Amino acid sequence: NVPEDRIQIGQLRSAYGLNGWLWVYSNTEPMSNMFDYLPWYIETKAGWQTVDVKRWKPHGKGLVVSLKGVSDRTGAESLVASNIWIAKSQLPKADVDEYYWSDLKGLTVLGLDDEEQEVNLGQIHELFETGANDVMVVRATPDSIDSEERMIPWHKDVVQRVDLEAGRIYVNWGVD
Ligand SMILES: [K+]
Structure with a gap:
């Protein structure tokens, strides 16, 4: 579950499209390095949730991401604006x-x-x-x-x- 010591590596922003994708803000540089961490610990309106990235892509200005198990517009809107964390000792893989x-x-x-x-x-x-x-x-x-x-x-x-x-x-x- 949620690690005691953790680092915030990003934040899920607005919903993108109708297939559950979401815009995402990265705290890493290059920005896409955030996608090398598995899993993600996001703090949602309904408690903590562990999530795996399935795919992602840069879109104009920033980045949009596809999370395993999130496939529709409603599933994205309920995650909008939640913070993304990783364990203090989590190496990128x-x-x-x-x-x-x-x-x-x-x-x-x-x-x-x-x-x-x-x-x-x-x-x-x-x-x-x-x-x-x-x-x-x-x-x-x-x-x-x-x-x-x-x-x-x-x-x-x-x-x-x-x-x-x-x-x-x-x-x-x-x-x-
Ligand atoms: K074929």
């Missing part, structure tokens, strides 16, 4: 740094179109090193949106969440 191909075999890659709708890009087929960076190879499947093979950079700003439980990888990557 970006999933890109914590996972390797062997752990990812057979996961579905979920991208995001311009209209913030989740698209089944396909399945992770390979994850190699080029020398300068790591690249994730995604191949189409019968479930997939199309038949293309996509090269997606294995960088924390693109591949944001690995969820072995759901067998999915959430990436801020579009169709075209």
Whole structure:
């Protein structure tokens, strides 16, 4: 539960869209570093709640975030303006740094179109090193949106969440 010693790393602002997203203010720099902490302890009007980030993206001025379990407008409005904390001894853990191909075999890659709708890009087929960076190879499947093979950079700003439980990888990557 709520850690005794904690640091405020941000604040959920206004509701964004109709799919439960929310604008969020970060106390970290670069701002998106707030997304490397898992989980989040937010103080809502109905007590404390622990929350996991599923995906996020910069939008014009600032940032908008998608929290696991918050999928509608009403779910976002009831969190609006709540503060975000982390334990004093909580180290950031970006999933890109914590996972390797062997752990990812057979996961579905979920991208995001311009209209913030989740698209089944396909399945992770390979994850190699080029020398300068790591690249994730995604191949189409019968479930997939199309038949293309996509090269997606294995960088924390693109591949944001690995969820072995759901067998999915959430990436801020579009169709075209
Ligand atoms: K397909």
